Subunit: 227 residues, 2 copies
């Protein structure tokens, strides 16, 4: 099928996939030129054997790095580390990243935290809310509870960085007092937890300001506008 | 202190033994501090500072001013990044960027699509206040699914290699952290009704090749 041209990147996402808009945001914020191909999961066009070849997991997003013989990176977290490590290499400037090893280990910690402790939990809460066969109030509570917990960890880390700086709402970040992919990983998701009953402005003030500083950046906005 | 590593795990935390295995396999000297989750020993104000998520495991890299890496995946990438630098040899990792993005893809798949699903399946089969069948099947099904993705990947590499059952790996026809990440978990799925030997033959030979390695064995012994 589709023959994506050897320059830039092609992103296989879905109109309602936060991890998708997550890669898009980082692409735009890093400058890279990319095109987004959405897919219909009900028309099962994501089971198209050629896509299945590049994304063994069958889940969006997937990014094809044409500049590299159509290399396909198929997990949002690995896509971010890829893009980030490739920018530092091409311009010697670690944007949204860090040159420090102890700094990177921290960026990764927050990235894995979001991808494996935060997104999954939000996903399960939406499931038991609107798509399960049965109706377990306890299943929903379990997850709205874990989502809040995970948000509390973030809220508190944000607070600590604000106080450690108090010695005026300036942006505070998770690592190196600089915007990194650690921070960006959460934004698309922060934007949808209200769907599972979580009000960030009321429940997580720090998180709310943090997301707000991020939602203000144009790179972040166009990406979210969509292709 | 200031030399080596300390690992805060738990006697039955797979992602904990995952870090232990890689430590052992990379040679680094480490001590493991188990935590009694019943006697609230992990709520110890001091631990909470190094491990902001409240979940095991956590690794302190003394050689680096007691730096704390608190996510098994971040821990793994730390260790192999620090070994390639130390010895110019990318053990359980790769020198190639395309290769790494692939190791990272499998690592993130394991940590965020595999481990969390097994955990829910276990929760609903053993720990949920209400033992709801539909809940359990949901996760039992998703675990089998993600295991299918692995099984089929492994198969592909065995055929692209057929010009006994030589070891086949997920990336670079070499054993990486991508492979090891799964091993502690593979060992537990029978607990949620999954027989890898009958259901996932490739996965079964893969885990077998990993379970034979002594480094893997002593680490699981419980250091």
């Amino acid at each position: 099928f589709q023959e994506q041209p050897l320059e830039g990147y092609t992103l296989f996402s879905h109109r309602s996939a936060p991890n998708g808009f997550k890669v898009a945001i980082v692409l735009s914020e890093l400058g890279f030129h990319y095109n987004t191909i959405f897919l219909d999961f009900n028309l099962g066009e994501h089971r198209a054997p050629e896509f299945v070849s590049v994304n063994p997991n069958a889940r969006v997003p997937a990014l094809i790095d044409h500049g590299m013989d159509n290399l396909s990176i198929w997990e949002s977290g690995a896509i971010l580390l890829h893009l980030v490590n490739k920018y530092y290499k091409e311009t010697g400037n670690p944007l949204l990243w860090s040159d420090d090893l102890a700094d990177q280990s921290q960026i990764n910690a927050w990235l894995f935290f979001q991808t494996s402790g935060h997104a999954p939990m939000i996903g399960q809460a939406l499931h038991f809310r609107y798509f399960h066969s049965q109706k377990i109030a306890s299943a929903v509570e379990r997850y709205t509870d874990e989502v809040r917990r995970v948000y509390g960890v973030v809220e508190m880390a944000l607070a600590e960085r604000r106080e450690a700086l108090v010695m005026f709402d300036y942006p505070v970040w998770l690592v190196g007092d600089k915007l990194t992919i650690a921070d960006l990983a959460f934004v698309p998701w922060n934007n949808v937890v209200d769907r599972i009953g979580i009000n960030i402005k009321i429940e997580f003030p720090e998180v709310y300001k943090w997301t707000k500083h991020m939602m203000r950046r144009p790179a972040v906005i166009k990406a979210l506008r969509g292709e």
